[PDB]
Amino acid sequence: NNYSYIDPTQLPYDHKWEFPRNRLSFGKTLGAGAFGKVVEATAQGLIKSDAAMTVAVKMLKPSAHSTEREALMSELKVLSYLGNHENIVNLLGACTHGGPTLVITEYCCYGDLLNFLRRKRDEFVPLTLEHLLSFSYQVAKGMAFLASKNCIHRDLAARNILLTHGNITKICDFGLARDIKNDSNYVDKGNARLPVKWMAPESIFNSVYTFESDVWSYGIFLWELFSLGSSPYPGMPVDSKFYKMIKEGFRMSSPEYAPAEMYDIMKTCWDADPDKRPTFKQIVQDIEKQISE
Numbered sequence: 001n002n003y004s005y006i007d008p009t010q011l012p013y014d015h016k017w018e019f020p021r022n023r024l025s026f027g028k029t030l031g032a033g034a035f036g037k038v039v040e041a042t043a044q045g046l047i048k049s050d051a052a053m054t055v056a057v058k059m060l061k062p063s064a065h066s067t068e069r070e071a072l073m074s075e076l077k078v079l080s081y082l083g084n085h086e087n088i089v090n091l092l093g094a095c096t097h098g099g100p101t102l103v104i105t106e107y108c109c110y111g112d113l114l115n116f117l118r119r120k121r122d123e124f125v126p127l128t129l130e131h132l133l134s135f136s137y138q139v140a141k142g143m144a145f146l147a148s149k150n151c152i153h154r155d156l157a158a159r160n161i162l163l164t165h166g167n168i169t170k171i172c173d174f175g176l177a178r179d180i181k182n183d184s185n186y187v188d189k190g191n192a193r194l195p196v197k198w199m200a201p202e203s204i205f206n207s208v209y210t211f212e213s214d215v216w217s218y219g220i221f222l223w224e225l226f227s228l229g230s231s232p233y234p235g236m237p238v239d240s241k242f243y244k245m246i247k248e249g250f251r252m253s254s255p256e257y258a259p260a261e262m263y264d265i266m267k268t269c270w271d272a273d274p275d276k277r278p279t280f281k282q283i284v285q286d287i288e289k290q291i292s293e
């Protein structure tokens with residue numbers, strides 16, 4: 001009782017982040033949910049006093065219920081605790097009065113990697129394989145950073161990797177990210193729609209989320225990447241047969257453009273035994289070896 005894990009969501013909001021909402025000009029909607037939406041916006045004087053910059057702004061709709069309002073604040077506090085990293089969509093500011101809560105993050109000008117791969121699919125040549133290895137490395141580095149902070153993301157997928165200048169990929173959407181603190185896992189108590197084809201079996205069957213279940217989803221991400229944006233498990237709807245096959249050990253085959261060593265990572269990320277999956281640290285070092293060779 002004299003020592004405890006500091007819950008980042010119990011910490012005070014740090015007003016160092018506060019930014020006046022009247023200096024934001026909202027534009028295109030980038031995504032929407034039951035919480036509200038994310039929009040592109042211009043922020044006047046956010047980093048430099050006399051300069052405008054493009055940001056993304058996540059906003060609660062005025063009708064948001066208590067469940068969604070405190071979820072957005074919790075997300076803000078998790079991002080504040082995680083700190084800056086090159087391979088995540090970083091927190092830049094927040095607006096916590098004058099209207100609904102707003103969370104201001106970096107804007108990634110090339111949008112999500114799933115649509116990017118689908119746009120570039122027709123003109124891909126072995127967009128090149130070098131780009132795909134880079135994206136695989138950068139996402140592993142982002143996730144290794146999250147795991148090093150005792151956090152899990154719980155919706156890792158190509159649709160939640162964004163691309164910005166310099167071919168830099170950033171992990172986005174931390175609405176479900178959790179510090180697992182003392183429990184070493186997270187049992188989800190919600191009742192929302194779930195990304196079934198990206199989930200580890202123990203998450204589907206027992207609602208348990210761990211470092212190892214994030215690694216399962218990374219394996220699925222890799223399959224999306226090297227198939228140039230195909231939907232996973234083609235020709236298999238989510239139904240009784242899907243769950244039985246996954247439980248019995250069915251796995252996707254190697255994508256057309258995956259190097260053998262990258263499919264090897266995929267297969268280990270999809271081990272039925274969570275303990276036999278690699279860590280993100282191990283994945284980074286493996287892909288590092290592949291790049292240098």
Ligand SMILES: Cn1cc(-c2cc3c(N4CCN(c5ncccn5)CC4)ncnn3c2)cn1
Nearest residue numbers: 030031032033038056106107108109111172173
């Ligand atoms: C066509 N195009 C789209 C972009 C784009 C999208 C984002 C972006 N998000 C964060 C996650 N989002 C979200 N959606 C629903 C629920 C929760 N989160 C929406 C997307 N964040 C930062 N930059 N950025 C740039 C550029 N071109």
